[PDB]
């Protein structure tokens, strides 16, 4: 906008008359310098060469987007427009920094959108939907980045090979948010694997205080994790998130150790195989979590081998299943 | 067949130099397996081509070649139009055109005619180049000859950006012929290869091209002096040893007097 | 049968030569780095 | 067949690696000599 204004001002009658007067007196130094020394022609040629990229740069849609689908659509449009960098002169490093800026804006937009969702006041299925959309957005970023990357390799293979500089790896700011969201997904997947079946574990076969205390402790750990803003990618939020995760691990470890004391009491009580299988059936969630299985490994040599010694039908396959949990054919020992 | 490669190289070094092209082409038909390798080692007189866009003579080499095409230094275009080609660079192209102008001036000052061509390409943390000069003797005078010079320079730019190291290897193929009343016909062919390394401070006052040109002219003067003095006076000495203008009786008398002189000197020490 | 065997031997020789070349490249890089630091400090004090 | 082209490609890779390794070794020796000579000269200047 300013270069075209200066170009208009250069063509004005007064400036042209001044240049003509100077040319009349054989002061050609000024006229030739004004033609070339200004650099206005080179600057105009470069800014016009940059014109296709800046002309239709669609970030207004992304900055105005408030839904994950709209953010994905805006990202796809942004990269479809960056596809037009082949016929626009632009430094490769500068374009890479521009992509970093786009990543920063994407991180800010995702943070603002997910902040408004109020994840505490809603259930887990919608949480899975939200993270599915978020990681779909991240995968769209990844594959559109890959397309732009192969395009940039093709572009830099032409023209200068840029032998002075080969550092081009990007440091997206949004990947730090992606990692945090992945950690939250893993934490809540483990939490659901606990929650959805520990109530079944503690359910009497159709009310004690240990069940209420354990469920209350699990919910208290969930609330302690939730009080910390998990989306806060900055340093202090990250340290608070680590502290909350450590406290959750401590509480779950304490509860699991109490359940392991119960597991020792199982062998303290049962004497034959049938009572072992009965008290195994009472406890289903304990088969999947990768801490109780060591205790199961203490009992397997007593039970499974014995059951094998009994075999060497469908009732006995049920006996084998009750020690290996649901879907007993998946285990390495259940294959045989 | 490295032994056969050495055989072919020695034979080509032994044959006369004027028929180097024809005899090399004939030898290619004998053992073609090493032919391109031979063409990498054997040095050949250069070829002239017409850049029609600018209307210039440019020299064909193996460094500007890309398949079956030769890149001009002025137009920066291959004489056969290649849809895909290896341009040197943006910066190295300005270095190339600056070198072309500088070496056109040098050729005009030292040769007064002929053709020149500077082709640059990039190199590991630096750049290499080849400066080719050709100069066919004009037909105005009885002297008829040819001069070819290929100077391959490698510039290793130090990290500081002020210092650089130049490695120059130059080959000169010379041919002269004179038909005078007394000498009747003399035909002096020859070839000579030399090399040298240096390091110089790159600066605005002393850019790369200045250093390369200084090295090239120093090598050219050294090769010219050596060819004129050592490698031609040796042939003069050989021709003087094959036959004696003075009679051998007079030479024997002079040598007897010389023996008397040296024994007298040896006695008084 | 013999073809795949010679691919194996030539691959062994090729990876050995490539590792030697990469080691030479690393030595060249170290020479460049130490040259940079030495030249920097010595030209500074000069 | 295709395995013959594999033989040929591996041979090209082997000879290219050998040539580049020889060039790297000679360049490393040359740059070491350049470094020590220039260091001697610059120490004399200092």
């Amino acid at each position: 906008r300013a270069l075209y204004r200066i170009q208009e001002k250069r063509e004005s009658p007064e400036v042209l008359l001044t240049l003509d007067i100077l040319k009349h007196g054989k002061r050609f130094h000024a006229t030739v310098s004004f033609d070339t020394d200004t650099g206005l022609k080179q600057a105009l040629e470069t800014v016009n060469d940059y014109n296709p990229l800046m002309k239709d740069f669609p970030l207004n849609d992304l900055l105005s987007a408030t839904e994950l689908d709209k953010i994905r659509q805006a990202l796809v449009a942004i990269f479809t427009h960056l596809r037009k960098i082949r016929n626009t002169k632009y430094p490769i490093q500068r374009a890479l920094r521009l992509v970093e800026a786009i990543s920063r804006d994407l991180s800010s937009q995702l943070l603002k959108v997910l902040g408004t969702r109020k994840l505490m006041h809603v259930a887990y299925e919608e949480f899975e939907k939200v993270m599915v959309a978020c990681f779909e957005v991240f995968q769209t970023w990844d594959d559109e980045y890959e397309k732009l990357q192969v395009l940039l390799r093709d572009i830099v293979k032409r023209k200068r090979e840029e032998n002075l500089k080969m550092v081009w790896r990007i440091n997206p700011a949004h990947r730090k948010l992606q990692a945090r969201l992945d950690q939250m997904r893993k934490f809540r997947r483990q939490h659901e694997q606990l929650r959805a079946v520990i109530v079944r574990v503690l359910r009497p076969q159709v009310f004690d205080a240990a069940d209420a205390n354990a469920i209350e402790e699990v919910n208290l750990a969930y609330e302690n994790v939730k009080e910390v803003d998990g989306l806060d990618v900055s340093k202090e939020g990250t340290e608070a998130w680590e502290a909350a995760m450590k406290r959750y691990d401590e509480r779950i470890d304490r509860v699991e150790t109490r359940i392991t004391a119960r597991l020792r009491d199982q062998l303290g009580t049962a004497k034959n195989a049938n009572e072992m299988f009965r008290i195994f059936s009472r406890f289903n969630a304990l088969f999947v979590r990768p801490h109780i299985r060591g205790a199961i490994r203490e009992y397997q040599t007593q039970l499974i081998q014995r059951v094998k010694d009994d075999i060497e039908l469908t009732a006995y396959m049920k006996r084998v299943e009750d020690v290996l949990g649901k879907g007993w054919e998946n285990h390495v020992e259940g294959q045989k | 067949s490295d032994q056969q490669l050495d055989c072919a190289l020695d034979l080509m070094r032994r044959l006369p130099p004027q028929q180097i092209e024809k005899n090399l082409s004939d030898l290619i038909d004998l053992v073609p397996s090493l032919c391109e390798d031979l063409l990498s080692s054997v040095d050949q007189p250069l070829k002239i081509a017409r850049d029609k866009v600018v209307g210039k003579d440019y020299l064909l080499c193996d460094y500007n070649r890309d398949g079956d095409s030769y890149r001009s230094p002025w137009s920066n275009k291959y004489d056969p139009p290649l849809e895909d080609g290896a341009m040197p660079s943006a910066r190295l192209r300005k270095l190339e055109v600056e070198a072309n102008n500088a070496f056109d001036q040098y050729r005009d000052l030292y040769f007064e005619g002929g053709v020149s061509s500077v082709y640059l390409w990039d190199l590991d943390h630096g750049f290499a180049g080849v400066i080719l000069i050709k100069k066919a003797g004009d037909g105005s005078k009885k002297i008829k000859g040819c001069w070819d010079s290929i100077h391959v320079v490698e510039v290793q730019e130090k990290s500081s950006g002020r210092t650089a190291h130049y490695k120059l290897t130059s080959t000169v193929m010379l041919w002269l012929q004179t038909n005078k009343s007394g000498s009747g016909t003399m035909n002096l062919g020859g070839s000579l290869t030399r090399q040298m390394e240096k390091d110089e401070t790159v600066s605005d006052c002393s850019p790369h091209i200045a250093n390369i040109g200084r090295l090239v002219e120093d090598m050219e003067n050294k090769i010219r002096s050596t060819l004129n003095e050592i490698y031609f006076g040796k042939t003069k000495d050989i021709v003087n040893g094959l036959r004696s203008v003075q009679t051998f009786a007079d030479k024997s008398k002079q040598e007897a007097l010389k023996n008397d002189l040296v024994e007298a000197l040896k006695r008084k020490q | 049968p013999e073809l795949l065997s010679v691919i194996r031997q030539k691959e062994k020789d090729l990876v050995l030569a490539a590792r030697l070349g990469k080691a030479l490249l690393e030595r060249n890089q170290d020479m460049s780095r130490q040259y940079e630091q030495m030249h920097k400090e010595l030209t500074d004090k000069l | 067949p295709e395995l013959l082209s594999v033989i040929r490609q591996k041979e090209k890779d082997l000879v290219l690696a050998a040539r580049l390794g020889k060039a790297l070794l000679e360049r490393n020796q040359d740059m070491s000599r350049q470094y020590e000579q220039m260091h001697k000269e610059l120490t004399d200047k200092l």
Partner: peptide, 14 residues
């Protein structure tokens, strides 16, 4: 060493 690196890069990928 970019030309050298690219030749190694083809070998490293394969």
């Amino acid at each position: 060493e970019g030309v050298l690196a690219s030749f190694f890069n083809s070998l490293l990928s394969k």
